């Protein structure tokens, strides 16, 4: 599932990680798990690339990390070199409210797939979560997390 | 509030024996989201008593090591609801079972259900039982869960889970 129609320019802004799911439990469980990354901002570039600004918990404290995502020939598919991942896929977005994406490594998706439901504002959006759950129905997820507003505000976010 | 629906007509005597914790879900992420999390507990056996009480043998990771625990569940007038005083919880709720393959249960603290509700899908044999998971997910549909984990056979047989 990819958004063939994607205009990356209109995803610019602050976002919050509302829910996360992954194929391997160890990718998400612990607060410092490798794919337990909280998105804070998306910054599209003039050439159609994407900077993903996120925070992680590392050694008991928040730390910022920036991931550079390169456009490819395939719509809504970006390539990265971070977190032992090499792809970012944008499944769907309405631009105004929510965006669904996954990260993976092409060489072993079973052992690397993590997807998120992002929202622009720190509120629970059940419409967005329903679309998220529908989209991963066919995906081999073994852990899923969903956050409340206190957590959206308070989890390593500027 | 969190309204629950426990198993009408449960016969606790038929649940005895070995079980494996196949999947877990909780209302509050911190209940489960660490090897050491308070409700990250792996059931080993269910042992109904002649008086209709229930001992739950389990293990969890605590102070660096996999520890054995024994939780005593006292019967109430509802056969599928038991009183406990362990893991900061005060109730065990049996939601459903077919006796022979799977059993779904939860623990909670009646004083703060949103901060305490953790449910599991148990199976009698160390394999991923997909119909058991489907029944677990349906039983969870009206519970406000914010974390769900499902284990594979290596994990079911892995140290602390057996």
From Swiss-Prot, chain A:
Keywords: Disulfide bond, Milk protein, Retinol-binding, Secreted, Signal, Transport. GO terms for molecular function: retinol binding. InterPro entries: Blactoglobulin (IPR002447), Calycin (IPR012674), Lipocalin (IPR002345), Lipocalin_CS (IPR022272), Lipocln_cytosolic_FA-bd_dom (IPR000566). GO terms for cellular component: extracellular region. Disulfide bonds join 62-156, 102-115, 102-117. It is found in: Secreted. Alternate disulfide bonds occur in equal amounts. Belongs to the calycin superfamily. Lipocalin family. Under physiological conditions beta-lactoglobulin exists as an equilibrium mixture of monomeric and dimeric forms. Lactoglobulin is the primary component of whey, it binds retinol and is probably involved in the transport of that molecule. This is Beta-lactoglobulin-1/B. The lineage of its organism: Eukaryota, Metazoa, Chordata, Craniata, Vertebrata.
């Amino acid at each position: 599932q990819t958004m063939k129609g994607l205009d990356i320019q209109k995803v610019a802004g602050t976002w919050y990680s509302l829910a996360m799911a992954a194929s391997d439990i160890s990718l998400l469980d612990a607060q410092s798990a490798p794919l337990r990354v909280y998105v804070e901002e998306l910054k599209p570039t003039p050439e159609g690339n994407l900077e993903i600004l996120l925070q992680k918990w590392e050694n008991g404290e928040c730390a910022q990390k920036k991931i550079i995502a390169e456009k490819t020939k395939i719509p809504a598919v970006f390539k990265i070199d971070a977190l032992n991942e090499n792809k970012v896929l944008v499944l769907d977005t309405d631009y105004k409210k929510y965006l669904l994406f996954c990260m993976e490594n092409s060489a072993e998706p079973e052992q690397s797939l993590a997807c998120q439901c992002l929202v622009r504002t720190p509120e629970v959006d059940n419409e967005a979560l329903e679309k998220f759950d529908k989209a991963l129905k066919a995906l081999p997820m073994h852990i899923r997390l969903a956050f409340n507003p206190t957590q959206l505000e308070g989890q390593c976010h500027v």
